[PDB]
Amino acid sequence: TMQIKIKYLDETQTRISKIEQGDWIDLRAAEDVTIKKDEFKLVPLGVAMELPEGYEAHVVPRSSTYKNFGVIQTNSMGVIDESYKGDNDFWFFPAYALRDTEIKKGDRICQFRIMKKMPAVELVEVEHLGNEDRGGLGSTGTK
Amino acid sequence: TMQIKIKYLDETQTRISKIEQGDWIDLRAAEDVTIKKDEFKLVPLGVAMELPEGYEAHVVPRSSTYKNFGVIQTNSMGVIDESYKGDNDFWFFPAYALRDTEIKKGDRICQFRIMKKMPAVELVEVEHLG
Amino acid sequence: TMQIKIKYLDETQTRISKIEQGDWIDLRAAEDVTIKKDEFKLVPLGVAMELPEGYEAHVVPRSSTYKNFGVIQTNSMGVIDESYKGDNDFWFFPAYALRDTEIKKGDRICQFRIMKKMPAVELVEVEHLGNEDRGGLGSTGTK
Ligand SMILES: O=c1ccn([C@H]2C[C@H](O)[C@@H](CO)O2)c(=O)[nH]1
Ligand SMILES: O=c1ccn([C@H]2C[C@H](O)[C@@H](CO)O2)c(=O)[nH]1
Ligand SMILES: O=c1ccn([C@H]2C[C@H](O)[C@@H](CO)O2)c(=O)[nH]1
Ligand SMILES: [Cl-]
Ligand SMILES: [Cl-]
Ligand SMILES: [Mg+2]
Ligand SMILES: [Mg+2]
Numbered sequence A, C: 001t002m003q004i005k006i007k008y009l010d011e012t013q014t015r016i017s018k019i020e021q022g023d024w025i026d027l028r029a030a031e032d033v034t035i036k037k038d039e040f041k042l043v044p045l046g047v048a049m050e051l052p053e054g055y056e057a058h059v060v061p062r063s064s065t066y067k068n069f070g071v072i073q074t075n076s077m078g079v080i081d082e083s084y085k086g087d088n089d090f091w092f093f094p095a096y097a098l099r100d101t102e103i104k105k106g107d108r109i110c111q112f113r114i115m116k117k118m119p120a121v122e123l124v125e126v127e128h129l130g131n132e133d134r135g136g137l138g139s140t141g142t143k
Numbered sequence B: 001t002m003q004i005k006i007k008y009l010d011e012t013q014t015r016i017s018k019i020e021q022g023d024w025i026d027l028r029a030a031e032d033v034t035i036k037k038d039e040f041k042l043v044p045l046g047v048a049m050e051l052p053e054g055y056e057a058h059v060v061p062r063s064s065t066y067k068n069f070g071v072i073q074t075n076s077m078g079v080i081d082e083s084y085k086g087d088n089d090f091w092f093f094p095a096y097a098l099r100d101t102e103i104k105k106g107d108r109i110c111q112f113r114i115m116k117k118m119p120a121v122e123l124v125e126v127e128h129l130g
Helices: A065-069 B065-069 C065-069
Strands: A002-008 A025-028 A033-035 A040-044 A047-050 A055-061 A071-073 A078-081 A092-097 A101-103 A108-116 A121-125 B002-008 B025-028 B033-035 B040-044 B047-050 B055-061 B071-073 B078-080 B092-097 B101-103 B108-116 B121-125 C002-008 C025-028 C033-035 C040-044 C047-050 C055-061 C071-073 C078-080 C092-097 C101-103 C108-116 C121-125
Touching (some): A033 A040, A055 A071, A065 A108, A092 A108, B055 B071, B065 B071, B065 B108, C033 C040, C033 C092, C065 C108
Parallel strands (some): A002 B121, B002 C121
Antiparallel strands (some): A002 A047, A025 A108, A033 A101, A040 A092, A055 A078, A071 A092, B002 B047, B025 B108, B055 B078, C002 C047, C025 C108, C033 C101, C055 C108, C071 C092
8 A cells, every 4th residue: 555665785685575474574685694692783784765855764673583593682672763764774773693693695684564653843942840750760660 | 443362371361451541551460470589480361463464562560569579570571463363372571580570460560552564675785884 | 742741860860852753762861870790780770750641652772772781681581560650650761781881971871662551451261272383483484
């Protein structure tokens, strides 16, 4: 219905696809990558996209990314704004390895979806809010 | 009002609840779990659910999970696909421990909400962007 | 535009305000913070807010946070509950350092957006779901 235009780094990239039981779409390593334990690598995903106007993309690991590849995503969740749409605006997955690992070209290491950007807001400075505190950081306990 | 249908692993699971000042709902460890420093374990949450038609769920840690339990969630924000609604599709929290830790049965360790899924989209391959 | 009321901790906090059309908004460390390798610290952000009615906020690292500071966010994506709007409900970024690091007062370290909260839902216990199993945790493989 809405269109995402996708440009691949080259012909050798494995084209991404929606699967029926996957609500997000898996993204793939653009090359083989070796990462040592406790080291970092920006893993190319080999895709550039023009998202629909007013949308952004979010990128997170798969549940199995750690078991299969030994990495976490250092930025937690990546945000790809609609403006990141140029011919050379390729996506990357920021990986920290918790064990020595090999990722192979084409491996499905993360997943993405789109959703609307937040509404327009205006931040208005006040000197006092006049509300009771909720508390946070575990105020409700654990049991 | 939308319904979430929840099936518990067994009668010993602590039934989950909404609290007024919690915009996401807390989920609980299904059993005692020990995790050693620099090890991974899938913490069972003791729940299987059928979400409203067209919805997914998202799962993240509580802010106090790291102090209390010394774990991070390896997938950052877990996505529960709408199709994960079978009788054996029990939810889990994928934990990596940064120190030796013990989690007790019933402990509130993460939180979830529901969200409309991304609609069907067309992926149109192009040679160049604009 | 929807209004967000923002209160700063003190006059020394670096103000955000600017024109806001949908992009995530950067937040800043409220004081200098030193973190040792493999240790944790709250990083105070020096802001308290009242979000629009019916909205929560989400906080993630900036894309450059790991490169600049060597930290990951321990809760991945922070959820600021709508009720966290008191005069002493100051936001924080929960940081774990993978190297020795220094964060300076005023340094941009994380980013946020608002989002409509999940509506009221009824939790209905059932004995049996009656659907086929999907499976999970990497059931679709990696290739
Ligand atoms: O995980 C991420 C997040 C962002 N980006 C893109 C979009 C953003 O504008 C740019 C700089 O962070 O890189 C990625 O490739 N991966
Ligand atoms: O943190 C997570 C992520 C996923 N899953 C289940 C549901 C999802 O549909 C399936 C595959 O990701 O695994 C969980 O229980 N926990
Ligand atoms: O990263 C986080 C997560 C939570 N909180 C506050 C707001 C939230 O309502 C409360 C409980 O999680 O703690 C933060 O300031 N930062
Ligand atoms: Cl979310
Ligand atoms: Cl979000
Ligand atoms: Mg999947
Ligand atoms: Mg909470």
